Symmetry: C2
Subunit: 382 residues, 2 copies
């Protein structure tokens, strides 16, 4: 990210309490018991950072101040004139926009667009959408229930109010299709690099025993291509090896084929290693059309339906951490054993580097090893 | 009361064997995820609560269920002529057998001879004396979508072995509480008219300290006129008046007692916020929601997932047992006090809970049975 959040001041939100939280540029582990408005704070941040300030028309507040790292100040006030409420979003740059709450309510019931275009023009001419924040809700089981889905945003705004931001989160029943599509697409990518290597190596060939030994070693080196005819041309190459400059060209082509073979599947092998780091006595893999699922040391195969809520939380969180700015995670301790809660932040900090990772947990087991980042929330009741 | 004593699963999913001995009450199973805690709970809910046809969707070898009185149920899945048959053999009773594919076709028909056969088999042997309630660990999904389609919805993504899902969601318990308040208001109004007609008949049929106590105890607005008249042999009937007023007060308390206990249960956990009901100034339509110490009111949608788990767990425990993962989205103090709050409201039944966090099992460490799958 660039404009990291430094300090957010919420005054009289829901007419109950005032809250001012200072954030670092790094990890932000907010620890506090339920009812602290942590979820609200996350929705406020996700409705400020991602340019969706129109959702603030559905929120009851007095004064909301958001300060970034570079020095941009956003002051939001809810003032009503002649029985009609107007939200004033005043930036530190000089410009300020104001709009009626009822106009935004009418626009939302229209979606069931002038103000939407006005908000888009305001955030585009002021460049308020430089950093996009990803929202990980604490109700991802509900996203599994209506199995990224786009109607889930409307369902969650239906039963949690219209202040809720856009919901883009992957279900267990969508990541199976996503993984199958990515594996077949990577196999097709391997086949296209085979055909490009054939045409380029034809042109290059048209223009020692160690090179022959290297070709014999590289002939043996699942990762089989989709176009099996090229696997049969490779079988014929191995059969010919069993039976100068052009040999160097052949060796370079085989080495580039092996390197692209590793590089096409490296992203999914990283995700599989990230999953299998937690899991014990059970491996998630892509044994063979691609089949994706669990494997056991007995050699038995099993569908992804045997997985527990804990393992489902790990799948839905590690896939949505690899496929990534500012990352906001709500309740990562759900249905997890204490050791996985201990190692979850270290695994996600190993896979998500270079971004502002804000997490909100109720269990302190999540915040081991990062106790200096533990910002304790406290509601200052009005 | 045939409480579960010992469950022996042999080669469940053709993976592992498990034999667990259960107490008569408060079976707090503690173990880390992936141990099939939910599995065993579904097995118990498909044995105790009837509905053995779901066992046709399960791959197993031998399942033995022992109750407290001594009833043994042996379920086996045996295939001979390339068709699997489920053999439900009871202790000292008749045994029933059926094809797996026939039961699958019977279930797919709902998408009934075998269903009637299973119902007759479990009815003639009296296997439904004690019913076990299933509290799923995915009750947020029940909030997402009593209700009968929710069972099929959950069986869609958890398999057809999953038992019947009967669990109340938020925004449905609000309707249940409002309906109960409306029913209590109609009950009070009918008891007013019944008390008026009965006291009319009894006064027509027939000390000053008792009259003073009756005047003090007086609190639609006929009681206000009675108190105004009291402020300004035969007197036995006056004693009847005091008794009638006292009986009215007693019925009034009982009318709200069923909901006030649940409100107290809510107010046992919740801090700096009270959940209560109020009536309108014009139509007396009940609103149920929060009451802040500032006097401000708010709907039940401001409540957090934690408080919603507390709402869904304190309700349907009073309306009475297998609970799956009661530690979800809960504070450590709430995990400490949840079993202590629920044991007063759920006493007298076998309460089986399965938790991943040992904080739930504080104060009941003698009941902590650690599950361990013995892989074949």
């Amino acid at each position: 990210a660039i404009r990291t959040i430094s300090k957010i001041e919420l005054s009289k939100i829901h007419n109950r309490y005032n809250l001012t939280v200072d954030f670092f540029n790094d990890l932000n582990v907010i620890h506090g018991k339920n009812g602290a408005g942590k979820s609200t704070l996350i929705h406020v941040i996700a409705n400020i950072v991602n340019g969706d300030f129109i959702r603030f028309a559905f929120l009851i507040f007095e004064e909301i101040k958001a300060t970034y790292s570079d020095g941009l100040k956003i002051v939001i006030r809810r003032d009503k004139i002649d029985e009609q409420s107007f939200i004033s979003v005043t930036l530190s740059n000089g410009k300020y926009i104001k709009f009626a709450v009822g106009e935004a309510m009418a626009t939302v019931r229209e979606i069931e667009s002038m103000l939407a275009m006005d908000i888009d023009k305001f955030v585009k001419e002021n460049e308020l959408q430089k950093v996009r924040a990803s929202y990980f809700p604490a109700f991802r089981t509900m996203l599994e229930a209506w199995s990224y889905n786009r109607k889930a945003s409307a369902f969650a705004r239906e039963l949690f109010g219209q202040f809720l931001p856009s919901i883009n989160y992957p279900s267990p029943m969508e990541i199976e299709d996503r993984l199958r599509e990515e594996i077949r697409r990577a196999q097709l990518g391997i086949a296209a690099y085979e055909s490009r290597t054939f045409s380029e190596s034809f042109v290059k060939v048209f223009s020692t025993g160690e090179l022959l030994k290297e070709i014999e070693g590289l002939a043996i080196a699942i990762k089989n291509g989709y176009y099996a005819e090229y696997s049969k041309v490779y079988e014929e190459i191995r059969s010919l090896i069993n039976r100068s400059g052009a040999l160097v060209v052949y060796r370079d082509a085989l080495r580039d084929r092996q390197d692209y073979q590793e590089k096409a599947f490296s992203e999914i092998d990283n995700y599989m290693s990230s999953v299998n780091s937690f899991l014990e006595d059970k491996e998630m893999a892509y044994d063979f059309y691609p089949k994706v699922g669990l494997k056991f040391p007995d050699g038995s195969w099993s569908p992804i339906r045997v997985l527990s809520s804990g393992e489902r939380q790990l799948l839905t969180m590690l896939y949505a951490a690899s496929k990534m700015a500012i990352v906001l995670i709500d309740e990562p301790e759900i249905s997890l054993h204490i050791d996985w809660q201990e190692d979850l932040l270290k695994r996600m900090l190993s896979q998500l580097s270079g971004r502002q990772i804000i997490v909100c947990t109720h269990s302190p087991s999540i915040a081991t090893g990062y106790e200096d980042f533990m910002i304790n929330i406290s509601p200052e009741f009005i």
